[PDB]
Amino acid sequence: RSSLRIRLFNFSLKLLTCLLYIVRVLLDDPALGIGCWGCPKQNYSFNDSSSEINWAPILWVERKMTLWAIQVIVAIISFLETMLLIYLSYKGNIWEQIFRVSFVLEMINTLPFIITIFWPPLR
């Protein structure tokens, strides 16, 4: 029954982290200024005339320190629990875990939250 508790924890964690993403996107305004992090923060407007698409709003989203710190812990424990359960269940076959499309999405969603610690401007 402990494994059921672990699975429930995983599912509740995933739901809570997408809820934190939606609360992040709800409390943030683009008109204030968008930048990488810290000092460089500057405004953008979109015009239908020029077909050039300015990507700066896409890569960089304004985020407060508290929300980032909360999300990083969730992502770290998420990856740790997922790979702990993967190591718990080998079935005599470590392969084919890459092509199962459940770990690629997880890992791509999770590693950047740890990488952000390496580069403070990348938060």
Q: Are 89 and 82 a contacting pair, CB within 8 Å?
A: no
Give the CA angle between residues 38, 44, 50 to the nearest 5°: 145
- Give the number of other CB atoms < 10 A from CB of residue 34: 20
Per the entry, the structure determination technique was cryo-EM
Cα 4 to the center of its chain, rounded Å: 25
31: which residues sit within 8 A by CB, 6+ positions away?
43
Integer Cα distance of 23 and 67 in angstroms: 9
Measured in angstroms, the resolution is: 2.9
> Of the candidates 77, 63, 97, 68, which has an alpha carbon nearest to the alpha carbon of residue 12?
77
3-state helix vs strand vs coil in the chain, percent to 5: 60, 0, 40
**20's tokens:** 């934190």
